[PDB]
């Protein structure tokens, strides 16, 4: 079975697929043609947005069947930093970041050297050549910032 | 191995050598950094009198909106205000992809699952700025094989601004005039904009500032929107 | 270019001109002193009488009884209340508070704990500001300090930043803002104010501009 699948710049690609297949399985088949990640797809039909765990069929989605591919580009990520005077700092950042180069953001936002600061989350301090990913720091997260001197 | 390339020598190359660095070893890993370091990149930056150039749009708190911070970095100018950005946004869905007005407005609300592309933002600018764009890969513009710079350059003519939309999988690690460095994540837009000294200044509203650099620094993957 | 200025002529410029020459030409180098000499520095001072403001004489304790005239805090009031705020705002196992604390190579430098301290013991709200993101800081730096500063009668400065900075000093030897130190100011009856760092031996009288545009003012409201 044919399907067709159309951008709004007009690019039109054709898979094969089997009305079973899962839309999480039609968005990975568009990865391996066009390399698109998942998360960057938005699939519509009748003017519906598609959902991961469901079929083709569940959707009357047939053979000659046209879907529109809308991406999605949303990418980033941000934490928040907590001073002892109250202010807090917001900073874009990503999960592979060492926690060196967040407090060189910290530094491009509020000009306090890397060595004057120590940053704490989950009760512990942070080590600088680990990453945010290693210590399970999550979007929105809060880090406290304290200021101490060698 | 470029762990031993120094800053220096980076500053002597050319922009395709430069470019060629980046395409080969400013990608970020699953979890650490590129090969690049902080130092080797900052030898791509040029000019730091960035005065005449802004940052317009800063990325808010919680808010998938970089392809209006794009186009308003791109002009100068609040040229998209929010309201505007989501009502034309919405008028696309539900005029062109079918979708009732009771969805559009669970896509609108729905911060976390909101995000545009391309298409969406060449429509925008035409239907409200009369501003035909064009877009292609930077790795698909013909003889991009013999420079880089030099196709990049020829596809852009004589624009002041282009879009970049990276797509795919990867994290780049980019030139900062700062600090800290601000990479290219995946999924996003960027801006950059074209001054008097036709010098290009490079527009992240998740970076920090403008930072001046060649155009063959853009990752070859990434795609290009150009006003005609 | 600085080393050809004479004390005389320094002693001639306005408040803003000799903040100009801090901010461009008073941070030492690595291994080497500044660009400006003890003399030079001293044409910064004003009166050079002897007030009835007094060095009260860890920097951040000595700032607060030097800008309070008075040991209004002893040192173990500091560090008792310094402990009451790690544990209860930084959600650790007060155990952790405790190797943060005791940790003499490694003592805090916080202007946050300052305010905190100064609400609940003194009932002192304070307000802060690094000197250059004052409001039209760039038309005038003294201008900006006096109308960001008021009606207080102290203020006190910590040097949040990577620079030491020489500084006038009003007897034989230069006592500079270190990296991470804390001094204060203390005003006088005439609207004059006195530079108090517990490191050096006498109060001196200088324009509220000598204070280098990066460091941090801490005021009371």
Not at chain 1, 33 to 49: H, N, T, V
Not at chain 1, 91 to 118: C, F, H, M, W, Y
Not at chain 2, 195 to 200: I, K, P, V
Request: with cysteine.
């Amino acid at each position: 079975m044919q399907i067709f699948v159309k951008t709004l710049t007009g690019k039109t690609i054709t898979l094969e697929v089997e009305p079973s297949d899962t839309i999480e399985n039609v968005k990975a088949k568009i990865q391996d043609k066009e390399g698109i990640p998942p998360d960057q797809q938005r699939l519509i039909f009748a003017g519906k947005q598609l959902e991961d765990g469901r079929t083709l069929s569940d959707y009357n989605i047939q053979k000659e069947s046209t879907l529109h591919l809308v991406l999605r580009l949303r990418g980033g990520m941000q934490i928040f930093v907590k001073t002892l005077t109250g202010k807090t700092i917001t900073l874009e950042v990503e999960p592979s970041d060492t926690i060196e180069n967040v407090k060189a953001k910290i530094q491009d936002k509020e000009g306090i050297p890397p060595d004057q600061q120590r940053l704490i989350f989950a009760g512990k301090q942070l080590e600088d050549g680990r990453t945010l990913s290693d210590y399970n720091i999550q979007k929105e997260s809060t880090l406290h910032l304290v200021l101490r001197l060698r | 191995n470029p762990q031993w390339l120094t800053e220096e020598q980076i500053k002597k190359m050319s922009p395709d050598e430069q470019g060629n660095l980046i395409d080969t070893y400013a990608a970020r890993k699953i979890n650490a950094a590129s090969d690049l370091t902080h130092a080797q990149l900052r030898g791509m930056i040029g000019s730091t009198a960035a005065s005449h150039i802004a940052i317009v749009n800063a990325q808010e708190t919680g808010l998938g909106h970089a392809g209006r911070y794009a186009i308003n970095n791109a002009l100068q100018q609040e040229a998209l205000s929010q309201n505007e950005f989501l009502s034309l946004t919405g008028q696309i869905f539900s005029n062109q992809l079918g979708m009732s007005l009771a969805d559009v407005k669970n896509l609108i609300q729905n911060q976390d699952d909101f995000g545009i592309d391309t298409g969406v933002l060449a429509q925008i600018l035409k239907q409200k700025f009369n501003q035909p764009v064009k877009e292609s890969k930077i790795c698909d513009l013909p003889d991009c094989a013999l420079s880089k710079q030099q196709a990049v350059e020829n596809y852009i003519g004589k624009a002041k601004w282009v879009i970049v939309a990276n797509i795919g999988t990867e994290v780049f690690d980019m030139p900062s005039s700062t600090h800290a460095v601000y990479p290219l994540t995946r999924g996003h837009f960027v801006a950059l904009r074209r001054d008097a000294d036709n010098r290009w200044w490079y527009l992240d509203s998740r970076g920090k500032n403008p930072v001046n650099i060649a155009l063959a620094i853009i990752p070859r993957t990434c795609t290009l929107i150009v006003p005609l």
